[PDB]
């Protein structure tokens, strides 16, 4: 490129469709005929004139919790945890480990909360722990 040679990609640009022009543009009226192409141009969000969108309230939502990490890692060997956010999670409100196809490599562990299948594996590997 010396700024007199440029040729960008294929499918990075297009026409813009100016409307209010032409007759042979494929436009000229652009919506209906007297119908409701007026300026406001709304049926009003979502509404047909009646009330099929009204169903019961089946709810509550208080505070909540944990993240996830599967047991599927083969990154570390013996490098017990809460050190890390690199090859696991970035954020932690409350940490928790789970299943996800087995870890045959033997590491310890350092965790809040624990899954059951995870427990019975990591005990058959090096360690189980709960803090």
């Amino acid at each position: 490129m010396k700024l007199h040679e440029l040729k960008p990609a294929e499918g990075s640009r297009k026409e813009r469709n100016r409307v209010g022009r032409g007759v042979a543009t494929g436009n000229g009226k652009t919506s209906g005929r007297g119908h409701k192409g007026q300026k406001a141009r709304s049926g009003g969000g979502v509404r047909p004139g009646f009330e099929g969108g009204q169903l019961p309230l089946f709810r509550r939502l208080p505070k909540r919790g944990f993240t996830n990490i599967n047991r599927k890692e083969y990154a570390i060997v013996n490098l017990d945890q809460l050190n890390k956010f690199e090859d696991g999670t970035e954020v932690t409100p409350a940490l928790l480990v789970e299943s996800g196809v087995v870890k045959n490599e033997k590491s310890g562990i350092k965790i809040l909360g624990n899954g059951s299948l995870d427990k019975k594996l990591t005990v058959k590997a090096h360690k189980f722990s709960a803090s």
């Binding site: 490129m1 010396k2 700024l3 440029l6 040729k7 960008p8 990609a9 990075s12």
Partner: protein, 199 residues
């Protein structure tokens, strides 16, 4: 790979150049969108226009609605009427968008490859002086349009901008529009490793 540093017209010891900066096999698409990202940013939005609202004018109905024999009109200021407003006028904007951190680096490295693709030169400059003598320096033949890449702050060569066609940054910011205009660049031996390592 390697280039031959030199001094005023005499060869000197070779050097090493990363395959990843000056062998990055440039990418046109990235380079395109990069440059448009720059050339858009300089564009400031200082234009303006008056709609039918801000315009000093009227809501007075000049003639009443009906009984006339002429049309029905509400103001003497509207896009029709001479002196009226200008509907869907242009108004200021940011004229600036973003690209990721990495596509930038890929761009810089791409263009810098586009030089070494053909030829990009190197020198050791310690000339602390202030003059047009730096034009006689071009016995290296270093064709017209150029940057002259120094380390951070120099206050000697940068006052010599006044030549008809060149540039002279520090490496702290070297930009792919400052580059891609000129076809012949040069650089310092001290600093080429910086840009190479800094990417």
């Amino acid at each position: 790979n390697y280039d031959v540093l030199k001094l005023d017209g005499t060869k000197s010891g070779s050097i090493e150049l990363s395959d990843a900066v000056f062998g990055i096999e440039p990418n046109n698409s990235v380079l395109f969108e990069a440059i448009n990202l720059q050339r858009a940013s300089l564009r400031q939005g200082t234009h303006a226009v008056k709609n039918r609202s801000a315009v000093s004018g009227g809501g007075r109905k000049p003639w009443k609605q009906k009984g006339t024999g002429r049309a029905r009109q509400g103001t003497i200021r509207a896009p029709q009427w001479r002196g009226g407003g200008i509907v869907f006028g242009p108004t200021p904007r940011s004229y600036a968008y973003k690209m990721p951190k990495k596509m930038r680096r890929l761009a810089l490295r791409s263009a810098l490859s586009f030089k070494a693709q053909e030829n990009g030169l190197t020198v050791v400059d310690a000339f602390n002086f202030e003059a047009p003598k730096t034009k006689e320096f071009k016995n290296v033949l270093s064709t017209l349009e150029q940057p002259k890449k120094v380390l951070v702050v120099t206050e000697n060569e940068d006052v010599n901008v006044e030549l008809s066609a060149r540039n002279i940054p520090g490496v702290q910011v070297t930009t792919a529009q400052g580059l891609n205009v000129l076809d012949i660049t040069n650089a310092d031996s001290l600093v080429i490793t910086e840009a190479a390592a800094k990417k």
